[PDB]
Design an enzyme around this catalytic site. Structure first.
Site, mmCIF file in Angstrom:
data_model
loop_
_atom_site.group_PDB
_atom_site.id
_atom_site.type_symbol
_atom_site.label_atom_id
_atom_site.label_comp_id
_atom_site.label_asym_id
_atom_site.label_seq_id
_atom_site.Cartn_x
_atom_site.Cartn_y
_atom_site.Cartn_z
ATOM 1 N N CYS C 399 0.828 -1.172 0.000
ATOM 2 C CA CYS C 399 0.000 0.000 0.000
ATOM 3 C C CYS C 399 0.861 1.219 0.000
ATOM 4 C CB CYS C 399 -0.922 0.025 1.221
ATOM 5 S SG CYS C 399 -2.011 1.466 1.293
ATOM 6 N N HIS C 526 -3.855 -6.777 0.181
ATOM 7 C CA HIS C 526 -3.322 -7.189 1.452
ATOM 8 C C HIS C 526 -3.453 -8.682 1.594
ATOM 9 C CE1 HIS C 526 -3.216 -2.950 2.611
ATOM 10 N NE2 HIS C 526 -4.467 -2.859 2.199
ATOM 11 N N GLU C 528 -1.886 -10.750 3.508
ATOM 12 C CA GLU C 528 -1.644 -11.338 4.794
ATOM 13 C C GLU C 528 -2.949 -11.774 5.363
ATOM 14 O OE1 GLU C 528 -0.774 -8.310 3.975
ATOM 15 O OE2 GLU C 528 -1.807 -6.875 5.157
#
Ligand SMILES: Nc1ncnc2c1ncn2[C@@H]1O[C@H](COP(=O)(O)OP(=O)(O)OP(=O)(O)O)[C@@H](O)[C@H]1O
Ligand SMILES: Nc1ncnc2c1ncn2[C@@H]1O[C@H](COP(=O)(O)OP(=O)(O)OP(=O)(O)O)[C@@H](O)[C@H]1O
Ligand SMILES: Nc1ncnc2c1ncn2[C@@H]1O[C@H](COP(=O)(O)OP(=O)(O)OP(=O)(O)O)[C@@H](O)[C@H]1O
Ligand SMILES: O=c1ccn([C@@H]2O[C@H](COP(=O)(O)OP(=O)(O)OP(=O)(O)O)[C@@H](O)[C@H]2O)c(=O)[nH]1
Ligand SMILES: O=c1ccn([C@@H]2O[C@H](COP(=O)(O)OP(=O)(O)OP(=O)(O)O)[C@@H](O)[C@H]2O)c(=O)[nH]1
Ligand SMILES: O=c1ccn([C@@H]2O[C@H](COP(=O)(O)OP(=O)(O)OP(=O)(O)O)[C@@H](O)[C@H]2O)c(=O)[nH]1
Lengths: 559, 559, 559
Positions: C399, C526, C528
């Site tokens: 990001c 994202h 994760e």
């Protein structure tokens, strides 16, 4: 053992003992060996030290227990005999545990409410649970426990915990949670309020206890919608919402409970079998109810005294009178005359009350000067006594009243106007009433004569003896310290004031019967404790009969 | 009287007495007559019945009071002398009030927590408030009250109410609310948590009490943001948010409090004047702190015993040792050897521990066999004793230890291998240790010898006497029941086991000094109660000196 | 539906979600359709508005739900998919009910917590109870409810009541009360304290709820005597006293619970059958445990950022890294470098930290510049980026990190030193990073791109594509608002900064891969959130591989 715990909130005087006694007798009718435990949060021990105006009568147990009247109520409703073991206070528990602490029974370690006190409490439960309170020496089948205090009182919290856990040490069906609450109803609105109950119950369920039945002290009966609201708020069945509206007399409550069918609930809840005819007695309470509804004339009695200011100080005394009223089937008015109002002090202060009191006194059919405490009103009391003696009005004196009656006699017959009670005047020229306590070994000082004692008749020619049934002796409740000075008794023997009852030693005087008087007797012992609806005590029944002007016919008819 | 109430929540052991003692000595430094009251919620009475493993030492007061050690801590921090009056329990209060109940002091009426108990509590406050605890027989100027229990404990609620109202009977400035709380910090997160404090304080303010200062037991110091959060949550100044982080030693706390400037707060809060130089002592705690920071070698001592499993059972004993360590300025290791691990039973069970224990024992510089209770480990204890005697290791035995030492001597010197203590073997061929209790009039049975008693020296040639300063007599704390059988003492008189100290009657033996041994002494009395940082007791100091191999030089140097 | 309610007291962070996830996966292993509800007392709605430093990651659900990470933890432990329905707040409930109030669904009558809110709560329970969270569209067999808050918090009281009654609307065996508590242990004493638990449980049972199992957050395991004490205090079996000592890693807890045999308890308590081999997986957790115990070298990663000050803000990020560490079987060090410490401001302030940070940075094997919020540290962040690019250190930007990386590239390659992010500098000569929100109909203004979105590969020649497995597209979690200015993208197309991933529209850039660099990539999405121990996401795994200098072999070996 079924453990029916009676709890309650909102306010004392809600009627826990009333319900307990009602259920108790019901359970006895069902055929259970019913016993009970009254747990008084009281820090103190021995109710006998408490004021009768503050609370009321101290019921004397067979063992000389000095306990709360509710236990006497239980003994009115059930034949069961209670002992001191049946009434526990926290003061009692304190000393008990403290002793064991000193004993090292706890290894010298600190004890705590939990587990130690709550365990002791549970122990106590068993200690009394195991005691039969009937001729049947069998562990009673159900114990109703009147837990005093209200929900929220710290005084009772230790027991909340004890019971919270206890109900799980016993089986579900062996424990019942009765919660008595209040449905107040303002007169300004007439709206029946449930919130107070919601508060109490909510708090109780917070504490961890959940009522199996909720008794609702109601004024008038609840309507459906109220019951339904309660049902929702408490999450209980409307069956479990028990409305016990105010009744004109307590005797109606067992019948109310029958209407409610609470028994059937118990049968299902406690898993108890029942053999039956009408479910329970029925003609016992039914007949009495019919009689209570079908009563003649109102006979009035002048209660003359101190503590006589209306209170329930005389609840068992009036109840004894009620027993007689039922037997004779007449109506009963209790006049409450402050003896003080009979005194010229009152004439000076408010002569309206003065003359009103005496007007009422004359209008009374009979008079009662019971025992009491304090020098206050002694004059008015004696004046009433002399009045009744002169007017040949049925007179019953009890304890103090008897004592004063003797003094009055001495003053206005023997002329010993300075005759007096040493209780109030140590400088008495003729000590009529003298302190004569009991001196038992192990006691320091004397003690008040108390307990069920035997009284012997001194003669066959005794009206009371006849009323008792020609008994050679009688056993009655005792509670009194001052006695007749025999120095003057001997001067009363040639007089028409005859002493009929004596203690076994032949020393203390218990019964006096004034000769040549329609009815003028005095007793030291306290028969109102033993009077029962079925077997009313005779000094009240006889007084009633005299008040009516039936007594001679009664005896003549066959006693 | 200023009434600084020390309350606390979350968990016991938070350090209320630690802070109390720290503030107390501070207030004394300020120049106030400081006194204190320890209120133990305890249902029991007499801490002397409690286990030393369960809690720890029972500090013996001058009057033979058997109380909590914290009061001894107070007597370490302040010269003040405390009496039994300074420690109250609810058990005590119970009996007290119950007595008055029996006395009719309440008119026979029930008493209740409110008002009656809370009044009694307030009375107690004054009863002790009025007692000086200094040579100055003047009502102390400030009383610090250690209220035991934690917020939420029913055991303490009566006092919450008493104080709630009390603080208003006294003036605002005459009452201070100290609340000790806890800032826990998980090791998994390291986040300092305030919520527990928020809970305690919230509850406390619910109860009606509002801290003037909140002591925060912190691990590491709090950061600003935490303090600011607390400030908001409690609505208190960040000044009032007192972070007392964990310190390596208690002595740092008074200094911490100085850093915090809590004194100045008190001056403003209690409206107290102060004359000063550095605000308070300073070199007292400062010098000691410097010394504590600047210490040589670590001298280790083998604590041999039962209750020796690490506990704080020996906190004042180790503290006494610390007093000596400070004097000599050396470091101190306390070895904790379960005497049981010295026994061949352990060899059989886990010989690792067996040999480890003995390895540690040898590695110790000196050994201490204190008193104790229970037959357990007696063998290992005696083995350690014989070991030390044979190895000429500095040996100090206390009470039981002394008793066992004598037995050991008899066994391995007189050959009386069956010599024993009647405490554990009633069938003893040579009853060395015999039950010799005191038989005071009014007592049923004997009693343990307890209290500050006088011990007389039997001789001038005594190492201990020299350490004391050639005193003809000494007065020490006593707490012990079994004594030397004189039947065998006389057989020990021709021996090199010399008895030096005796009670006034010349009967009970208090001091024994083994001749021809660098240091092998035993005492019955308990000097650790009287040892102070300034005046350390000599049997521990002397033991230290022997452990070091300095003692002869010390005495030679001039004692 | 079995309703396992997870409650807890004393302190947040006790590990309710940890246990919930452990049990959940256990129940799934058992073979149950497990679902769960997280009830957050929160007054607010939408966790997505909360700070990641304040709390941590906002797990993005498939439906773009912005919820607490614990639900992602649940999705790590169970394959189950959760929706916004699975997370309720009181803010949510407020608006919901308020709407119905406006609707007149309550007849315009006031609604109250009881019954109305507690009913709504129970409704919610069913609303989610009825939702399958598996491919199996069948009402789940067991719902574990993480009730947030601690006992005593008013925020949760409405639910205490809801559940109190609820557990009785469902059957006993259909409801389980799990209570997590805390056994704190001071380091100063080492004494395991139970009182806090006693307090919590007591309060809970006051409230009316009684744990079936009590999870005890312990430091080290409890000893027997403690367990026995708890058993007594709580009146629960020592089986029910569950000590869950602190573990080095969460993965040990399911195994601990197995050791405890809590499953068997559930089988008996919930009356659940179980077919089994080892009771549950076993080799799943067992093998992993073996691998966790048997790890090579420690690879370190420099977490560079703001919120990087240690917090758990990066718990799922580190966990993602752990997934990779397990795959490769190496050890993992997380360095926490405040990007601010990399700035010359720090050099001016404390150059120790300045140089230390850079020393650590160099010592790191790879670097991670994740997303973040705030202008703070942007310089140090970019400096780190340029450093890694120059030094050819494995770089992963996420990001913001990717955004800054592009800016850095422009500045130090295109010479556009004034290139900047409009996020922080509206006066930018080369607006690289521009606000490009989504403008969906019904929305006022733009919105952040959020949710599981599809990203398309722009080319086959992509390292990441290869790591993914030559997929034409990928779907990832999104949460981001600013995008690459295409005005300059076109000036980056002739450059070696190649953009590989794009949104479906082909407008927003999601993946960038710097050419001629061992590993320098940036992603907006994202991953994760989707990385799992079994299927680790590839940008972290690939980063690890680069950090190791294995990656080329890996791909060469066969990917
Ligand atoms: N249903 C009822 N109808 C009429 N009077 C009632 C009813 N229930 C109770 N009472 C009256 O309420 C009063 C209080 O009774 P009682 O003493 O038994 O209550 P309690 O709750 O057990 O408090 P305590 O034992 O301390 O007096 C009595 O005068 C009794 O006659
Ligand atoms: N600030 C502190 N730093 C280090 N140790 C501390 C601190 N405060 C207290 N302690 C330790 O905490 C323990 C408990 O102390 P203490 O007994 O005085 O506490 P309390 O709260 O008064 O409970 P109690 O009187 O029943 O033991 C002791 O071992 C003491 O040394
Ligand atoms: N048994 C345990 N061993 C080690 N760490 C643990 C254990 N239980 C919990 N933790 C840690 O405690 C912290 C708090 O976890 P978690 O968030 O799940 O708790 P919670 O009680 O559900 O409060 P919240 O959901 O608001 O964060 C985490 O860092 C977690 O790793
Ligand atoms: O001024 C006021 C007074 C009271 N109230 C509101 O009155 C409500 C209490 O309402 P009720 O008194 O009607 O309670 P209830 O229905 O449970 O039972 P009874 O009263 O019939 O015994 C509460 O919900 C409170 O918010 C107000 O909103 N404003
Ligand atoms: O799963 C959970 C756990 C907890 N919570 C929420 O966590 C909040 C407790 O928040 P905190 O634990 O942060 O309280 P605090 O800031 O006052 O102090 P410390 O913790 O730092 O000591 C409460 O407001 C509760 O609603 C949830 O919403 N969900
Ligand atoms: O100064 C004090 C402090 C505390 N107390 C007394 O300490 C008692 C608390 O005792 P504990 O802290 O030992 O409680 P516990 O055994 O239930 O569990 P743990 O502590 O091991 O977790 C309470 O009963 C209180 O009266 C005092 O009497 N005085």
């Amino acid at each position: 053992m079924k453990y029916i715990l009676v709890t309650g909130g909102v306010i004392s005087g809600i009627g826990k003992g009333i319900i307990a006694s009602s259920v108790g007798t019901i359970l006895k009718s069902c055929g259970l060996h019913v016993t009970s435990i009254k747990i008084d949060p009281y820090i103190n021990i021995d109710a006998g030290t408490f004021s009768p105006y503050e609370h009321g009568e101290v019921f004397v147990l067979d063992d000389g227990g000095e306990v709360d009247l509710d236990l006497g109520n239980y003994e009115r409703f059930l034949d069961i005999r209670l002992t001191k073991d049946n009434n526990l206070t926290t003061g009692k528990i304190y000393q008990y545990v403290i002793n064991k602490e000193r004993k090292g029974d706890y290894l010298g370690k600190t004890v705590q409410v939990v587990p130690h006190i709550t365990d002791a409490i549970q122990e106590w439960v068993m200690r009394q649970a195991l005691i039969p309170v009937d001729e049947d020496g069998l562990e009673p089948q159900v114990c109703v426990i009147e837990l005093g205090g209200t929900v929220g009182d710290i005084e009772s919290m230790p027991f909340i915990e004890a019971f919270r856990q206890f109900q799980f040490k016993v089986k579900r069906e062996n424990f019942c949670n009765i919660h008595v609450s209040l449905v107040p109803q303002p007169s300004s609105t007439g709206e029946q309020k449930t919130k107070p109950t919601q508060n109490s119950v909510r708090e109780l369920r917070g504490l961890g206890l959940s009522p199996d039945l909720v008794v609702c002290r109601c004024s008038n009966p609840l309507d459906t919608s109220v019951k339904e609201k309660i049902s929702m708020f408490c999450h209980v069945e409307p069956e479990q919402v028990i409305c016990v509206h105010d009744v004109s007399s307590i005797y109606r409550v067992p019948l109310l409970l029958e209407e409610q069918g609470v028994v059937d609930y118990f049968l299902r809840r406690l898993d108890l079998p029942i053999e039956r005819q009408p479910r329970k007695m029925l003609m016992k309470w039914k007949e009495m109810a019919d009689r209570y509804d079908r009563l003649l004339e109102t006979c009035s009695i002048a209660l003359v005294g101190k503590y006589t200011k209306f209170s329930d100080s005389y609840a068992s005394v009036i109840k004894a009178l009620e027993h007689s009223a039922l037997a004779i089937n007449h109506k009963l008015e209790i006049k409450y005359i402050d003896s003080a109002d009979l005194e010229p002090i009152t004439s000076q202060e408010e002569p309206v009350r003065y003359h009103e009191a005496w007007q009422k006194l004359c209008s009374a059919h009979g008079v009662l000067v019971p025992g009491g405490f304090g020098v206050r009103g002694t004059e008015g009391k004696i004046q009433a006594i002399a009045w009744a003696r002169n007017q040949k009005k049925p007179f019953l004196g009890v304890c103090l009243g008897m004592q004063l009656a003797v003094v009055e006699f001495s003053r206005n017959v023997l002329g010993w106007q300075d005759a007096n009670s040493t209780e109030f005047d140590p400088t008495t020229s003729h000590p009529v009433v003298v302190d004569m306590p009991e001196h038992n070994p192990g006691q320091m000082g004397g003690t008040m004569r108390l307990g069920k004692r035997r009284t012997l008749f001194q003669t066959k020619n005794s009206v009371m003896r006849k009323l008792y049934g020609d008994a050679d002796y009688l056993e009655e409740r005792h509670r009194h310290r001052f006695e007749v000075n025999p120095v003057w008794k001997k001067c009363l023997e040639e007089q028409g004031l005859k002493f009929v009852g004596q203690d076994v030693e032949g020393e203390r005087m218990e019964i006096v019967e004034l000769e040549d008087h329609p009815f003028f007797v005095g007793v030291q012992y306290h028969p109102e404790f033993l009077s029962r609806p079925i077997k009313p005590s005779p000094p009240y029944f006889g007084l009633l009969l005299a008040s009516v002007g039936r007594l001679s016919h009664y005896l003549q008819k066959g006693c």
